[PDB]
């Protein structure tokens, strides 16, 4: 009782997620959720993101469910876990993968 469970993701905390070597199953999820590689490579967003894969049953559950979520209802896999992750992404409060070229909130 009270045992910990580690998900075999193998993501980097400094570099972020290996979007360059991510699986078409899990990588597709982030895309469906409107998550750009910039967020997958961000140490901050990377942490909250991969953590979601743990709630979905781990990396194995993602690729696994992605296959199971491609038959029931419609046919396209996305209407489900993608909805949850979409919320997790909102856990940043103001995380926007944008570039400040000359903006200023204060005026």
Short mmCIF file of N, CA and C in Angstrom, two decimals:
data_model
loop_
_atom_site.label_atom_id
_atom_site.label_comp_id
_atom_site.label_asym_id
_atom_site.label_seq_id
_atom_site.Cartn_x
_atom_site.Cartn_y
_atom_site.Cartn_z
N UNK A 1 0.84 -1.23 0.00
CA UNK A 1 0.00 0.00 0.00
C UNK A 1 0.86 1.26 0.00
N UNK A 2 0.44 2.26 -0.77
CA UNK A 2 1.19 3.50 -0.85
C UNK A 2 2.40 3.39 -1.75
N UNK A 3 2.31 2.55 -2.77
CA UNK A 3 3.41 2.36 -3.71
C UNK A 3 3.35 3.39 -4.84
N UNK A 4 4.51 3.87 -5.26
CA UNK A 4 4.59 4.85 -6.33
C UNK A 4 4.64 4.17 -7.70
N UNK A 5 4.17 4.88 -8.72
CA UNK A 5 4.17 4.34 -10.08
C UNK A 5 4.83 5.32 -11.05
N UNK A 6 5.85 4.85 -11.75
CA UNK A 6 6.57 5.68 -12.70
C UNK A 6 6.20 5.32 -14.14
N UNK A 7 5.88 6.34 -14.94
CA UNK A 7 5.52 6.13 -16.33
C UNK A 7 6.75 6.19 -17.23
N UNK A 8 6.90 5.18 -18.09
CA UNK A 8 8.04 5.11 -18.99
C UNK A 8 7.91 6.12 -20.12
N UNK A 9 8.21 7.38 -19.83
CA UNK A 9 8.14 8.44 -20.83
C UNK A 9 9.53 8.77 -21.36
N UNK A 10 10.48 8.95 -20.44
CA UNK A 10 11.84 9.24 -20.83
C UNK A 10 12.01 10.63 -21.42
N UNK A 11 11.26 11.60 -20.90
CA UNK A 11 11.35 12.97 -21.39
C UNK A 11 12.43 13.73 -20.62
N UNK A 12 13.00 14.75 -21.26
CA UNK A 12 14.05 15.54 -20.62
C UNK A 12 13.44 16.73 -19.87
N UNK A 13 13.95 17.01 -18.66
CA UNK A 13 13.45 18.12 -17.83
C UNK A 13 14.02 19.46 -18.26
N UNK A 14 15.21 19.43 -18.86
CA UNK A 14 15.87 20.65 -19.31
C UNK A 14 15.57 20.91 -20.79
N UNK A 15 15.60 19.85 -21.58
CA UNK A 15 15.34 19.96 -23.01
C UNK A 15 13.85 19.80 -23.30
N UNK A 16 13.15 19.10 -22.41
CA UNK A 16 11.72 18.88 -22.59
C UNK A 16 11.41 17.54 -23.22
N UNK A 17 10.33 17.48 -23.98
CA UNK A 17 9.92 16.25 -24.64
C UNK A 17 10.71 16.05 -25.94
N UNK A 18 10.98 14.79 -26.27
CA UNK A 18 11.72 14.47 -27.48
C UNK A 18 10.81 14.48 -28.70
N UNK A 19 10.16 15.61 -28.94
CA UNK A 19 9.25 15.75 -30.08
C UNK A 19 9.90 15.26 -31.36
N UNK A 20 11.23 15.30 -31.41
CA UNK A 20 11.97 14.85 -32.58
C UNK A 20 11.92 13.33 -32.71
N UNK A 21 11.67 12.65 -31.60
CA UNK A 21 11.61 11.19 -31.60
C UNK A 21 10.35 10.68 -30.91
N UNK A 22 9.34 11.54 -30.81
CA UNK A 22 8.07 11.16 -30.18
C UNK A 22 7.31 10.17 -31.05
N UNK A 23 6.39 9.44 -30.43
CA UNK A 23 5.59 8.45 -31.14
C UNK A 23 4.40 9.10 -31.83
N UNK A 24 4.08 8.67 -33.06
CA UNK A 24 2.96 9.22 -33.83
C UNK A 24 1.63 9.15 -33.07
N UNK A 25 1.58 8.29 -32.06
CA UNK A 25 0.37 8.13 -31.26
C UNK A 25 0.25 9.24 -30.22
N UNK A 26 1.25 9.33 -29.35
CA UNK A 26 1.25 10.35 -28.30
C UNK A 26 1.50 11.74 -28.88
N UNK A 27 2.40 11.82 -29.86
CA UNK A 27 2.71 13.09 -30.49
C UNK A 27 1.48 13.69 -31.15
N UNK A 28 0.64 12.82 -31.72
CA UNK A 28 -0.59 13.25 -32.37
C UNK A 28 -1.53 13.88 -31.35
N UNK A 29 -1.54 13.34 -30.14
CA UNK A 29 -2.39 13.85 -29.07
C UNK A 29 -2.11 15.33 -28.82
N UNK A 30 -0.86 15.64 -28.49
CA UNK A 30 -0.45 17.02 -28.24
C UNK A 30 -0.91 17.93 -29.37
N UNK A 31 -0.76 17.46 -30.60
CA UNK A 31 -1.18 18.23 -31.77
C UNK A 31 -2.68 18.49 -31.72
N UNK A 32 -3.45 17.43 -31.48
CA UNK A 32 -4.91 17.55 -31.40
C UNK A 32 -5.31 18.54 -30.31
N UNK A 33 -4.50 18.60 -29.26
CA UNK A 33 -4.77 19.51 -28.15
C UNK A 33 -4.26 20.92 -28.44
N UNK A 34 -3.76 21.15 -29.66
CA UNK A 34 -3.25 22.46 -30.02
C UNK A 34 -1.92 22.78 -29.37
N UNK A 35 -1.24 21.76 -28.87
CA UNK A 35 0.05 21.94 -28.22
C UNK A 35 1.19 21.91 -29.24
N UNK A 36 1.94 23.01 -29.31
CA UNK A 36 3.05 23.11 -30.25
C UNK A 36 4.33 22.55 -29.65
N UNK A 37 5.26 22.15 -30.51
CA UNK A 37 6.53 21.60 -30.06
C UNK A 37 7.21 22.53 -29.06
N UNK A 38 7.03 23.83 -29.26
CA UNK A 38 7.63 24.82 -28.37
C UNK A 38 7.25 24.54 -26.92
N UNK A 39 6.02 24.08 -26.72
CA UNK A 39 5.53 23.76 -25.38
C UNK A 39 6.07 22.41 -24.93
N UNK A 40 6.21 21.48 -25.88
CA UNK A 40 6.73 20.16 -25.58
C UNK A 40 8.22 20.22 -25.25
N UNK A 41 8.88 21.26 -25.75
CA UNK A 41 10.31 21.44 -25.51
C UNK A 41 10.56 22.39 -24.34
N UNK A 42 9.50 23.02 -23.83
CA UNK A 42 9.63 23.94 -22.71
C UNK A 42 9.68 23.18 -21.39
N UNK A 43 10.74 23.39 -20.62
CA UNK A 43 10.90 22.71 -19.34
C UNK A 43 9.66 22.84 -18.47
N UNK A 44 9.03 24.01 -18.52
CA UNK A 44 7.84 24.27 -17.70
C UNK A 44 6.63 23.50 -18.22
N UNK A 45 6.25 23.76 -19.46
CA UNK A 45 5.10 23.11 -20.06
C UNK A 45 5.36 21.62 -20.26
N UNK A 46 6.62 21.26 -20.46
CA UNK A 46 7.00 19.87 -20.64
C UNK A 46 6.61 19.05 -19.41
N UNK A 47 6.88 19.61 -18.24
CA UNK A 47 6.57 18.95 -16.97
C UNK A 47 5.08 18.66 -16.83
N UNK A 48 4.26 19.70 -17.01
CA UNK A 48 2.82 19.55 -16.86
C UNK A 48 2.24 18.64 -17.94
N UNK A 49 2.83 18.68 -19.13
CA UNK A 49 2.34 17.87 -20.24
C UNK A 49 2.58 16.37 -20.01
N UNK A 50 3.85 15.96 -19.93
CA UNK A 50 4.17 14.55 -19.75
C UNK A 50 3.42 13.99 -18.54
N UNK A 51 3.27 14.81 -17.50
CA UNK A 51 2.55 14.41 -16.30
C UNK A 51 1.14 13.94 -16.65
N UNK A 52 0.57 14.55 -17.69
CA UNK A 52 -0.77 14.18 -18.14
C UNK A 52 -0.77 12.75 -18.66
N UNK A 53 0.28 12.40 -19.41
CA UNK A 53 0.41 11.05 -19.94
C UNK A 53 0.34 10.03 -18.82
N UNK A 54 0.73 10.45 -17.62
CA UNK A 54 0.70 9.58 -16.45
C UNK A 54 -0.74 9.36 -15.99
N UNK A 55 -1.56 10.40 -16.11
CA UNK A 55 -2.96 10.31 -15.71
C UNK A 55 -3.74 9.47 -16.71
N UNK A 56 -3.25 9.42 -17.95
CA UNK A 56 -3.90 8.65 -19.00
C UNK A 56 -3.46 7.18 -18.98
N UNK A 57 -2.73 6.79 -17.93
CA UNK A 57 -2.26 5.42 -17.83
C UNK A 57 -0.82 5.27 -18.29
N UNK A 58 -0.11 6.39 -18.38
CA UNK A 58 1.28 6.34 -18.80
C UNK A 58 1.45 6.30 -20.30
N UNK A 59 2.69 6.45 -20.76
CA UNK A 59 3.01 6.43 -22.18
C UNK A 59 2.35 5.23 -22.87
N UNK A 60 2.40 4.08 -22.21
CA UNK A 60 1.84 2.86 -22.78
C UNK A 60 0.33 2.98 -22.95
N UNK A 61 -0.31 3.70 -22.03
CA UNK A 61 -1.76 3.89 -22.08
C UNK A 61 -2.15 4.86 -23.19
N UNK A 62 -1.28 5.83 -23.46
CA UNK A 62 -1.54 6.82 -24.50
C UNK A 62 -1.56 6.16 -25.87
N UNK A 63 -0.43 5.61 -26.28
CA UNK A 63 -0.35 4.91 -27.56
C UNK A 63 -1.43 3.83 -27.63
N UNK A 64 -1.66 3.17 -26.49
CA UNK A 64 -2.67 2.12 -26.40
C UNK A 64 -4.08 2.67 -26.61
N UNK A 65 -4.44 3.71 -25.86
CA UNK A 65 -5.77 4.29 -25.95
C UNK A 65 -5.99 4.97 -27.29
N UNK A 66 -4.92 5.51 -27.86
CA UNK A 66 -5.00 6.18 -29.15
C UNK A 66 -5.52 5.21 -30.20
N UNK A 67 -5.16 3.94 -30.03
CA UNK A 67 -5.61 2.89 -30.94
C UNK A 67 -7.05 2.50 -30.64
N UNK A 68 -7.38 2.42 -29.35
CA UNK A 68 -8.72 2.05 -28.92
C UNK A 68 -9.71 3.19 -29.17
N UNK A 69 -9.20 4.42 -29.20
CA UNK A 69 -10.04 5.59 -29.43
C UNK A 69 -10.14 5.91 -30.92
N UNK A 70 -9.81 4.94 -31.77
CA UNK A 70 -9.89 5.15 -33.20
C UNK A 70 -10.91 4.25 -33.86
N UNK A 71 -11.83 3.71 -33.07
CA UNK A 71 -12.86 2.84 -33.60
C UNK A 71 -14.24 3.18 -33.08
N UNK A 72 -14.37 3.26 -31.76
CA UNK A 72 -15.65 3.59 -31.13
C UNK A 72 -16.03 5.04 -31.42
N UNK A 73 -17.26 5.24 -31.91
CA UNK A 73 -17.71 6.58 -32.23
C UNK A 73 -16.90 7.21 -33.33
N UNK A 74 -17.57 7.66 -34.38
CA UNK A 74 -16.88 8.27 -35.50
C UNK A 74 -15.81 7.37 -36.08
N UNK A 75 -14.55 7.73 -35.85
CA UNK A 75 -13.42 6.95 -36.34
C UNK A 75 -12.10 7.60 -35.95
N UNK A 76 -12.08 8.93 -35.97
CA UNK A 76 -10.88 9.68 -35.63
C UNK A 76 -10.63 9.67 -34.13
N UNK A 77 -9.38 9.44 -33.74
CA UNK A 77 -9.01 9.43 -32.33
C UNK A 77 -8.62 10.83 -31.87
N UNK A 78 -9.32 11.32 -30.85
CA UNK A 78 -9.06 12.66 -30.31
C UNK A 78 -10.15 13.09 -29.34
N UNK A 79 -11.40 12.78 -29.67
CA UNK A 79 -12.53 13.15 -28.83
C UNK A 79 -12.54 12.32 -27.55
N UNK A 80 -11.76 12.77 -26.57
CA UNK A 80 -11.66 12.06 -25.31
C UNK A 80 -10.51 12.58 -24.47
N UNK A 81 -9.40 11.86 -24.50
CA UNK A 81 -8.21 12.25 -23.74
C UNK A 81 -7.74 13.64 -24.15
N UNK A 82 -7.91 13.98 -25.42
CA UNK A 82 -7.49 15.28 -25.93
C UNK A 82 -8.23 16.40 -25.21
N UNK A 83 -9.46 16.10 -24.78
CA UNK A 83 -10.24 17.09 -24.06
C UNK A 83 -9.66 17.36 -22.69
N UNK A 84 -9.19 16.30 -22.04
CA UNK A 84 -8.57 16.42 -20.72
C UNK A 84 -7.27 17.22 -20.81
N UNK A 85 -6.37 16.76 -21.67
CA UNK A 85 -5.09 17.44 -21.86
C UNK A 85 -5.30 18.91 -22.17
N UNK A 86 -6.33 19.20 -22.97
CA UNK A 86 -6.65 20.58 -23.32
C UNK A 86 -6.81 21.42 -22.07
N UNK A 87 -7.32 20.81 -21.01
CA UNK A 87 -7.50 21.49 -19.74
C UNK A 87 -6.17 21.60 -19.01
N UNK A 88 -5.42 20.51 -19.00
CA UNK A 88 -4.11 20.49 -18.36
C UNK A 88 -3.23 21.62 -18.89
N UNK A 89 -3.34 21.88 -20.19
CA UNK A 89 -2.58 22.95 -20.82
C UNK A 89 -2.98 24.30 -20.23
N UNK A 90 -4.23 24.39 -19.78
CA UNK A 90 -4.73 25.61 -19.17
C UNK A 90 -4.22 25.78 -17.74
N UNK A 91 -3.52 24.77 -17.23
CA UNK A 91 -2.98 24.82 -15.88
C UNK A 91 -1.83 25.83 -15.78
N UNK A 92 -1.35 26.30 -16.93
CA UNK A 92 -0.28 27.29 -16.95
C UNK A 92 -0.80 28.66 -16.56
N UNK A 93 -2.10 28.88 -16.77
CA UNK A 93 -2.76 30.14 -16.44
C UNK A 93 -2.57 31.20 -17.52
N UNK A 94 -1.37 31.28 -18.07
CA UNK A 94 -1.08 32.29 -19.08
C UNK A 94 0.00 31.83 -20.05
N UNK A 95 0.21 30.52 -20.13
CA UNK A 95 1.23 29.98 -21.04
C UNK A 95 0.81 30.13 -22.49
N UNK A 96 1.55 30.94 -23.21
CA UNK A 96 1.30 31.15 -24.62
C UNK A 96 2.60 31.04 -25.40
N UNK A 97 2.72 30.01 -26.21
CA UNK A 97 3.92 29.82 -27.00
C UNK A 97 4.04 30.91 -28.06
N UNK A 98 4.35 32.12 -27.60
CA UNK A 98 4.48 33.27 -28.48
C UNK A 98 5.86 33.91 -28.33
N UNK A 99 6.17 34.86 -29.21
CA UNK A 99 7.45 35.54 -29.17
C UNK A 99 7.26 37.05 -29.03
N UNK A 100 7.93 37.63 -28.04
CA UNK A 100 7.84 39.07 -27.80
C UNK A 100 8.84 39.83 -28.66
N UNK A 101 8.35 40.38 -29.77
CA UNK A 101 9.20 41.14 -30.68
C UNK A 101 9.16 42.63 -30.37
N UNK A 102 8.12 43.06 -29.66
CA UNK A 102 7.99 44.46 -29.31
C UNK A 102 6.66 44.78 -28.67
N UNK A 103 6.27 43.97 -27.69
CA UNK A 103 5.01 44.16 -26.99
C UNK A 103 5.25 44.69 -25.58
N UNK A 104 4.17 45.05 -24.90
CA UNK A 104 4.26 45.58 -23.54
C UNK A 104 2.89 45.64 -22.88
N UNK A 105 2.63 44.71 -21.97
CA UNK A 105 1.35 44.65 -21.27
C UNK A 105 1.10 45.94 -20.49
N UNK A 106 2.15 46.46 -19.86
CA UNK A 106 2.05 47.68 -19.08
C UNK A 106 2.11 48.91 -19.98
N UNK A 107 1.31 49.92 -19.66
CA UNK A 107 1.29 51.14 -20.45
C UNK A 107 0.86 52.35 -19.64
#
